[PDB]
Amino acid sequence: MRKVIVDSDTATDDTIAILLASRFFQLLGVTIVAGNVNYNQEVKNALFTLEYIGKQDVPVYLGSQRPILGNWRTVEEVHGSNGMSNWNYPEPNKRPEKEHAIDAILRLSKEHEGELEILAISPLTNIALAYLKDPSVVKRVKKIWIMGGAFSKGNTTPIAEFNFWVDPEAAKIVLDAGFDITIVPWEVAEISGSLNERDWEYISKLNTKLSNFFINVNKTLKEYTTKNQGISGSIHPDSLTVSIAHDNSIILDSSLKYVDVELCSKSRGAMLIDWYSLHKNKPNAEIVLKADGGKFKNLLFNSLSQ
Template structure:
């Protein structure tokens, strides 16, 4: 439990998604996290598929009472662009999971976010593992919520190479304007980007053990990890290559155990101009200002706690211990 004290009130905004599902399983079962709500946004698949997947995962995890709301079905400006080639046609690795038995709450995502944030007795940690469309709409529509947000820990961005483009990570690239709004809202932000996202990998022996579990949540985690091979060219059906990346779930590990993530507070801005750099998170790691600032002046930039290193074994152990041995 963070600091060995009270639970951290958490709201997840997701586009479930194989690794979003891994994150939900962890959040439900970690004793230091109080998962107050989940909101859904288009990203890995369409928003209705995201809602269906989210409800199914929560039921499998034994947390069917967590409120879930449908959010934005497209980015603020761009057309929606899914990642089904990564997550399968249904967004969940085409595992043929049963349809959920319940429906989302009778409120949109922004309404549920506002309600749960303001109702929380302690400041909430928002964990978006998806394009930031819902979060930007919330912050623009109800800026008063910032007084009860402790921090935003988002999976997105990259200080180095991207994946959607050579320099842009998918979640930020999918809705760059939403990311720019979120980063400039005046809330403390941790960026759990590709620089650490790809490094936390569960070994194949552990994946196989999870898949053989009699407990539905642990077994689902194993099946999802098997669909997320650690190496892009690996095949899930290859017994020698079935280690799996935690992906988004690492951002929840960073909430539960922040000491496992090494961050540096650095200026970050989002490239919004058309062209190959659109959606890039420009992370300024220079030790001093350069000629641009000397000749043109210093622009106002947002300081973000950027994840640049991670204790891989610590987070793998944390994830496995939580998903296998704890119940909600």
């Protein structure tokens, strides 16, 4: 079985991404990073999630409580005040581990050398800081699956997607490190990570433990997505990314390009792609261009059905 770490800013769809990761892979741990909502709450949400889903022995490690330069805002309008659509859930009794996420990533990369894969469904701060501490980590990590970036439809600024915007320095460091990277950008999630009202009716009538979990945590994500898309639905970028890592045929089309990240001015966080290979930098990532949404929906439905 393939071995993963999920690096998460735990709220809403990140929780479903962990759920899915715990079924498809040997989940060696969940590392926490600043992003979506208050960090302590993110940590609470991850521990509760792993407990609820019967994976109490997956360790949670605390990582950076800020991006490298400390410039971001939380998005409670998308995820709820608690990152769980204000579902007042029962306090978990699971606790985090002592080891820092940076130390854990570096350790797990030695123990599982050549096999470790990272599902990076958050700002890239922990991975960038691990790499700066020990650059030989690139020898040992098999693959990184990154949710982030946008071609043009920034969801946070006009141009920038949330993860890259929170920590563009981290994104830049990770992209030029020399990892094997596939990137799942926002536009691909918007189309292929989408659920419509009938998909919601169907999940809602499942009345399983995991289906009620899904409805409960993602209520605010659906409200927000419905507002911005102008049709009832929700968008699930981290679940899609985890599904693609597992089943690579969910990728219908992709390209190997040189991907850069703007650090400055109004365009801070922008994903800059040398589409025409005119600028003499070597390709550093596979960018997903089209994905199979039906196939994601069925993996998701199946996991909530169990």
